[model samples]
Target: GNSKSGALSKEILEELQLNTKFTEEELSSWYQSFLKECPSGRITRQEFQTIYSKFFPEADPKAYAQHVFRSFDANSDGTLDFKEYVIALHMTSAGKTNQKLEWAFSLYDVDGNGTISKNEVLEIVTAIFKMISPEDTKHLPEDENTPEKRAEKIWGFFGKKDDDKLTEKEFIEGTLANKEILRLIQFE
Candidate 1:
């Protein structure tokens, strides 16, 4: 019922809440939180896995994260930096695996530095829904977010190394190297 509007709206979530499994308040909160964390549908697969695990604890977070991360690593650079990670997630989200290598290279190499900046990654992410369905991508913030708070949350989500930038290799290792990130996600 919530999806009947052909767009995610509060009324729609309220309808879905009619089901016993999810209270209206809980579902509404989840929807709000989802909009907050991923204003654009461009969340890291690892982060998505954590959310999915809330409903499917038996799912292997590592395998799930790796499946998505490995697929994203088109260059096989052992890291999933912004560009790489975004591509993989985009392809996976679309349920396609054909590596658009040329497209990937062209889209990501923004500054001619031969590297993918977080800005570039965010660009790819924002572009995905913009191209596919603007309606789906619409998460115009309910309130303006201060630049400082925005930077802090974004860095916390993507910049584990905290170098203010993400190199290709570092990106891959950050997604895959942290075994604990996966282990901690598994449930009792």
Candidate 2:
């Protein structure tokens, strides 16, 4: 019955310790909270949207949540298992900057293609602008106020390339150079 209920096993916990930055003890604690909240040990896309709704009360998270949820579903099985949840949580929040950037690449790679397009980056950046509190954007000059101009400014910082799409290497290096500006959509 407990197994059917999806309780975390020691084996899973140890593996999590290796993959995520969490210790076995911390991962165990996270699972306890996860069970109390999710109970099912997994979340479908709609359930995922609902979760995002709570975190982003001010803006509509439908599109952005959909994108992030798809990326978070690493195994492509259409749901986020507890293991997936924990690893995603760690990588999105506290993992190394490099790890987080790699995850962002997958997030921006909306079509599951190896490269990210300017359109894909713009769409996500606009969605991110909507999700972020208005105060966060207040610091930027008026020239880069709207999503289009902001996206253009950020892309310009990518430095070079006649090509329109950025391969993973280009994205990583392009982002590394534009860290401050790219940070806006880095998590989205």
Candidate 3:
């Protein structure tokens, strides 16, 4: 580990402590990992994908990582700085129940207009299937083996038309109403 790095500043430490579930030591620990991972103090989309790939070596993590990284990208500038990274680390994991569910909803609604379209839901489900690697798919049948087929069935859990995109309120209700759906969507 590089001990030559500067300590996290007062502003960053306090802000992180205030905004996230992490304590000073937790933030400091993550800071070290962050520096070791990317010395430039920022994590790019590809870098974030690398981390996801590391987490899911047996699965195709690229697409899944993209969506997750984009959502974590608070300023929408396509990079996650220390503050965003630390904050993301908590919210996606140990923070709050609704936060992660809301995260899945946002993750599903890639366009971010509140409502999510059918095929967009397909994109997300494919990415999730890519990450989770459901071996049971192959075991089940050839028709259900494709990711989009999985997506088709999953979206069928929601509703009627391609024009009938599900809004955030509906998404929240969907996940809350069905924890099984929540299980597939949220990482933790």
Residue-wise C-alpha lDDT for candidate 2, range 30-77, written one tens digit per residue: 667767875565677777777776666777767677777777585758
Better of 1 and 2 by lDDT: 2
Worst 10 residues of 2 by lDDT: 1-10
Which pairs of residues have clashing backbones in candidate 2? Answer: none
A best-first ranking of the candidates according to their TM-score comes to 2, 3, 1
Roughly what TM-score does model 3 have, to 2 decimal places? 0.74
Candidate 1 residue runs with Cα over 4 Å from true position: 1-107, 138-154, 160-162, 177-188
Across residues 34-106, which tens digit of lDDT does each residue of candidate 1 receive? 5576565444545645654564454344333423443334353644443233233333233213332223333
lDDT of 3 by residue, 98-181 (tens): 333455566667767778876777777777666655664465446546666666666777665756878877777876677676
- Candidate 2 wrong stretches, greater than 4 Å: 1-20, 53-63, 95-100
Each candidate structure's TM-score, on Cα atoms with residue i matched to residue i, is: 0.28, 0.77, 0.74
Overall local distance difference test of candidate 2: 0.68
Best by lDDT: 2
For TM-score, candidate 1 versus 2, the one ahead is 2
lDDT (CA) for every model shown? Answer: 0.40, 0.68, 0.65
**Order of quality (lDDT):** 2, 3, 1
The TM-score that candidate 2 achieves is: 0.77
